[PDB]
Design an enzyme around this catalytic site. Structure first.
Site, PDB file in Angstrom:
ATOM      1  N   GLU A   1       0.944  -1.346   0.016  1.00  0.00           N
ATOM      2  CA  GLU A   1       0.045  -0.101   0.095  1.00  0.00           C
ATOM      3  C   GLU A   1       0.641   1.141   0.190  1.00  0.00           C
ATOM      4  OE1 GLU A   1      -2.844   1.872  -0.525  1.00  0.00           O
ATOM      5  OE2 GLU A   1      -3.929   0.508   0.303  1.00  0.00           O
TER       6      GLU A   1
ATOM      7  N   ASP B   1      -2.176  -5.033   1.005  1.00  0.00           N
ATOM      8  CA  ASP B   1      -1.382  -3.965   1.917  1.00  0.00           C
ATOM      9  C   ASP B   1       0.115  -4.381   2.034  1.00  0.00           C
ATOM     10  OD1 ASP B   1      -3.592  -2.317   1.564  1.00  0.00           O
ATOM     11  OD2 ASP B   1      -4.337  -3.254   3.474  1.00  0.00           O
TER      12      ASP B   1
ATOM     13  N   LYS C   1     -14.138  -7.878   3.297  1.00  0.00           N
ATOM     14  CA  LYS C   1     -13.081  -8.065   2.899  1.00  0.00           C
ATOM     15  C   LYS C   1     -12.856  -9.545   2.364  1.00  0.00           C
ATOM     16  CE  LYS C   1     -10.384  -4.260   3.761  1.00  0.00           C
ATOM     17  NZ  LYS C   1     -10.112  -3.314   2.335  1.00  0.00           N
TER      18      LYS C   1
HETATM   19  C1  LIG Z   1      -8.767  -0.209  -3.463  1.00  0.00           C
HETATM   20  C2  LIG Z   1      -9.255   1.074  -3.114  1.00  0.00           C
HETATM   21  C3  LIG Z   1      -9.277   1.750  -1.864  1.00  0.00           C
HETATM   22  N1  LIG Z   1      -9.849   2.795  -1.573  1.00  0.00           N
HETATM   23  C4  LIG Z   1      -9.849   3.238  -0.152  1.00  0.00           C
HETATM   24  C5  LIG Z   1     -10.638   2.324   0.838  1.00  0.00           C
HETATM   25  C6  LIG Z   1      -9.811   2.619   2.175  1.00  0.00           C
HETATM   26  O1  LIG Z   1     -10.119   3.795   2.815  1.00  0.00           O
HETATM   27  C7  LIG Z   1      -8.378   2.688   1.762  1.00  0.00           C
HETATM   28  C8  LIG Z   1      -7.422   1.358   1.640  1.00  0.00           C
HETATM   29  O2  LIG Z   1      -8.256   0.313   0.919  1.00  0.00           O
HETATM   30  P1  LIG Z   1      -7.722  -1.185   1.383  1.00  0.00           P
HETATM   31  O3  LIG Z   1      -8.324  -1.492   2.691  1.00  0.00           O
HETATM   32  O4  LIG Z   1      -8.639  -1.903   0.105  1.00  0.00           O
HETATM   33  O5  LIG Z   1      -6.480  -1.372   1.422  1.00  0.00           O
HETATM   34  O6  LIG Z   1      -8.295   3.152   0.413  1.00  0.00           O
HETATM   35  C9  LIG Z   1     -10.841   3.454  -2.468  1.00  0.00           C
HETATM   36  O7  LIG Z   1     -11.352   4.744  -2.050  1.00  0.00           O
HETATM   37  N2  LIG Z   1     -10.786   3.108  -3.680  1.00  0.00           N
HETATM   38  C10 LIG Z   1     -10.277   1.854  -4.023  1.00  0.00           C
HETATM   39  O8  LIG Z   1     -10.383   1.414  -5.106  1.00  0.00           O
HETATM   40 MN   LIG Z   2      -6.390  -2.367   3.280  1.00  0.00          MN
HETATM   41 MN   LIG Z   3      -4.680  -1.556   0.199  1.00  0.00          MN
END
Ligand SMILES: Cc1cn([C@H]2C[C@H](O)[C@@H](COP(=O)(O)O)O2)c(=O)[nH]c1=O
Ligand SMILES: [Mn+2]
Ligand SMILES: [Mn+2]
Length: 178
Positions: free
Chosen positions: A61, A89, A115
């Protein structure tokens, strides 16, 4: 909220977050709660990565897409771990598994299932944190020691407390959707 983010997160985190939002066509000055969620998530990821042995974790990430998948594919090629469908991540070198981190404004269990449902991949480990001290991880395996975890959980409470002292918490807390 914009001023809160700019004051509570470091500039590197704020730049990555601004960049991620613009890539989706959203304005951090308008979707300010999303701005804060993204920064908080990034911050958690960085803290988690600093929470075991030196070199225990690879951060995925926060990297641009090309470098992200370069890391992932290189790891898969060298460990023969399965190639995930979505960028996770972190990678845990000690456990040899990808980690998906969630930070939720709702409840830990619901986010965990969301998730899980997205991932499909059997191998990727999920760890969720809330702003109220709860956590939830695949097979109750929390990866880091309880003192590392306590520092993440405490930092998230401290964010929540700051938002509340500025009257930002109510809106933030109700901004996450399934
Ligand atoms: C993959 C993705 C994550 N996000 C945001 C949601 C979460 O606050 C943060 C991390 O996402 P993740 O938990 O999927 O790593 O990024 C978006 O707004 N758009 C996206 O396409
Ligand atoms: Mn995440
Ligand atoms: Mn992520």
């Amino acid at each position: 909220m914009e001023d809160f983010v700019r004051q509570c997160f470091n500039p590197m985190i704020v730049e990555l977050a601004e960049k991620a939002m613009k890539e989706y066509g959203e304005d951090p000055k308008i979707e300010t709660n999303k701005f804060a969620a993204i920064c908080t998530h990034l911050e958690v990821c960085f803290m988690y990565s600093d929470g075991g042995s030196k070199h225990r974790f690879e951060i995925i990430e926060g990297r641009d897409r090309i470098m992200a998948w370069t890391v992932v594919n290189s790891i898969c090629n060298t460990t023969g771990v399965e190639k995930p469908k979505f960028l996770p991540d972190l990678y845990d070198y000690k456990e040899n598994r990808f980690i998906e981190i969630g930070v939720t404004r709702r409840e830990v269990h619901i986010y965990y299932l969301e998730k899980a449902n997205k991932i499909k991949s059997e191998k990727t480990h999920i760890h969720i944190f809330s702003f109220t001290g709860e956590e939830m991880a695949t097979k109750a395996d929390y990866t880091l020691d309880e003192e590392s975890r306590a520092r993440i959980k405490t930092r998230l409470f401290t964010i929540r407390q700051e938002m509340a002292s500025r009257s930002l918490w109510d809106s933030f807390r109700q901004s996450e959707r399934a």
